[PDB]
Amino acid sequence: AYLWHRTAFILAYRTPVVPEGAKAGASFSANGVALRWLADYDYSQLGDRTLLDV
Amino acid sequence: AYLWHRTAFILAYRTPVVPEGAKAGASFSANGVALRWLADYDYSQLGDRTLLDV
């Protein structure tokens, strides 16, 4: 069990920017954290690829 | 120093045609020469790539 003050632990967040070369882009919130959604089509394997990141 | 008649040297320029797959297709100008600019997102390396050429 841990018993800590609100200012004991630091969390640092930075949502990545969607580059101009990304065919898709959006921003979703996970428990108050803005994420970056990116979709790229993989023609070689004939499949879509997604990515949420922070 | 170089002294040349107009017919001594010849340049030929051609702007590459932006294909139907390139996401970004802005076209720029350098010294009156039109340049092709395209951007593609390498998802395999998690990085953007930009190309400006002629």
- Is the distance from CB of B2 to CB of B9 less than 8 angstroms? no
Give the integer Cα–Cα distance in Å for A20 and A54: 18
Resolution of this structure in Å: 3.6
Both tokens of residue A31?
């428990």
How many CA atoms are closer than 13 Å to the CA of B17, on its beta-carbon side? Answer: 2
Q: Does B48 touch chain A (CB under 8 A)?
A: yes
Q: Which residues of B touch A42 (CB under 8 A)?
A: 43
Instruction: For residue A54, give both structure tokens.
Output: 């922070």
Other beta carbons less than 10 A from residue B12's beta carbon: 4
CA B54 to CA B34: how far, in whole Å? 7
